[PDB]
């Protein structure tokens, strides 16, 4: 509860309003936020119907020990031109400095702005204090459905409500403007797979080897490798994720790899960088890919597929057995501005 | 140089005859790297007789033979078919220990009592 009053002094003047937010364990258990004191939070908001990017601000978070209980934060709210937008996502990115951890937690302003609604010279000494009392108002997250609390601290103030500027006609429907990200990334994945299937047709519905791996001679194994490709087309199309490898490659300034979990046997680990490997496509460059410990297991093993994305937005789908199909993400110049603004 | 030399008699034993004669052979291998033609010269040391070492050299270069001839399913040029050649650089006496040295490091063997006897190149494949 000290973490609210610290941010009013140092995050405060760099913002317009702060959304003082306390996250209970029920919200923490869903997103798997392991409360160590080393975690460095960072916040930025993704605008709608405007050029969407704001500056990243580092926000202090402290665990509250016990009347709720959970992680305490403070989210920045940005009023460009004197008013708030209702459909405007405030993104929280959770990461550790040393170890490998990256989480994205997103909040919408209508779940925040609504919840805010109810002689020697003397030197001034203003310490940080928890003297101000909290008012705890309920909220539910739109994206996961897990409850979190919002603090409203006591201080043309009581006369007005907090401003909003609702969107105007013509408009997409608000279930499709809320998930503006998950409907843009999904149609870049559904058009990526249509390039992978197009390479089968120009070859004659075949899968050719690329990686020298000896395959045991059994007829049931040769029919099982084909089943890993068709399962990989069910997973790449359903995948609409903020942290995919091709978003990391488009916002890069290095091969970006993401392994999949076929038949839901594994959760996905996305955006792994292949440092020291230049995916030129020559046969001497696949030895540097095989020196990675993941591709030795996505190929010798089973039930895991693997996608390796070049910085030129060309990607191979690596199957077990060394079979691969070159595919291409098509990103126009208008969409690179849309991606490098909101994500990079 | 210790890098170029490839020994040939090496066993756990897991028994071979002794003799008076162990012969250093040279080899020179035509290959292609980065779609550009290039050579590779290695050395061999064994007293097994010429009928075994040509079969022992082919087992050493098994991988390099296969990765070249994957190309000529598409283009068959009779000039490209020649692969390697083996000379005989002269004899070494049996049980002379090659003494390791190091120079600037560069590890470099040395052979006592080496006597030279040049031979022709015979084209193995």
């Amino acid at each position: 509860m000290d973490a609210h009053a610290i941010n009013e002094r140092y995050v405060g003047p760099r913002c317009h309003r702060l959304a003082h937010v306390v996250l209970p364990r029920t919200f923490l258990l869903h997103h798997a936020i392991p409360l160590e004191p080393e975690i460095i939070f960072s916040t930025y908001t993704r605008f709608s119907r405007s050029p969407g990017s704001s500056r990243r601000l580092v926000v202090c978070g402290k665990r509250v020990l016990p009347s709720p209980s959970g992680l305490a934060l403070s989210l920045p709210l940005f009023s460009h031109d004197g008013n708030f937008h209702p459909f405007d996502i405030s993104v929280l990115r959770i990461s550790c400095p040393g170890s490998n951890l990256s989480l994205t937690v997103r909040f919408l302003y209508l779940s925040l702005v609504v919840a805010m609604g109810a002689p020697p010279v003397r030197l001034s000494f203003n310490p940080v204090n928890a003297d101000v009392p909290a008012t705890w108002r309920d909220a539910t997250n739109v994206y996961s459905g897990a409850p979190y609390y919002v603090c409203v601290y006591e201080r043309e103030d009581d006369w007005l409500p907090i401003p909003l500027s609702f969107p105007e006609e013509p408009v997409p429907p608000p279930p499709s403007l809320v998930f503006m990200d998950d409907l843009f990334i999904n149609t870049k994945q559904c058009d990526f797979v249509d390039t992978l299937e197009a390479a089968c047709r120009t070859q004659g519905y075949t899968l050719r080897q690329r990686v020298p791996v000896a395959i045991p001679r059994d007829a049931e194994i040769a029919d099982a490798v084909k089943s890993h490709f068709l399962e990989a087309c069910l997973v790449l199309r359903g995948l609409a994720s903020e942290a995919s490898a091709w978003i990391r490659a488009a916002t890069s300034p290095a091969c970006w790899m993401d392994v999949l979990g076929l038949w839901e046997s594994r959760p996905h680990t996305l955006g792994l960088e292949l440092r020291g490997v230049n995916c030129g496509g020559t046969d001497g460059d696949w030895l540097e890919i095989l020196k990675q410990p993941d591709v030795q297991k996505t190929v010798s093993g089973s039930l895991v597929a693997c996608v390796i994305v070049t910085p030129a937005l060309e990607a191979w789908l690596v199957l077990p057995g060394g079979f691969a199909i070159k595919g291409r993400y098509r990103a126009s110049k208008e969409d690179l501005v849309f991606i490098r603004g909101r994500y990079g | 140089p210790c890098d170029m030399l490839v020994d040939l008699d090496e066993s756990c034993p897991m028994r071979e005859p002794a003799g008076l004669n162990v012969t250093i052979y040279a080899s020179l291998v035509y290959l292609r790297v980065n779609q550009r033609p290039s050579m590779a010269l290695t050395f061999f040391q064994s007293g097994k007789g010429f009928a075994e070492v040509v079969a022992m050299i082919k087992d050493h270069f098994t991988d390099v033979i296969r990765t070249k001839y994957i190309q000529l399913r598409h283009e068959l040029y009779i000039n490209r078919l020649v692969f390697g050649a083996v000379c005989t650089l002269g004899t070494v006496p049996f049980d002379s220990h090659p003494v390791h040295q190091s120079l600037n490091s560069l590890p470099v063997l040395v052979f006592a009592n080496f006597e030279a006897a040049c031979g022709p190149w015979t084209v193995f494949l």
Partner: peptide, 29 residues
Amino acid sequence: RFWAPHPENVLFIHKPTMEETRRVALGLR
């Protein structure tokens, strides 16, 4: 016995089971 690695090793994919798989990915999206 194993199969030897070679860049002409092919696996012929059926046309119907690639399209019946395409029907499933429509529904789960």
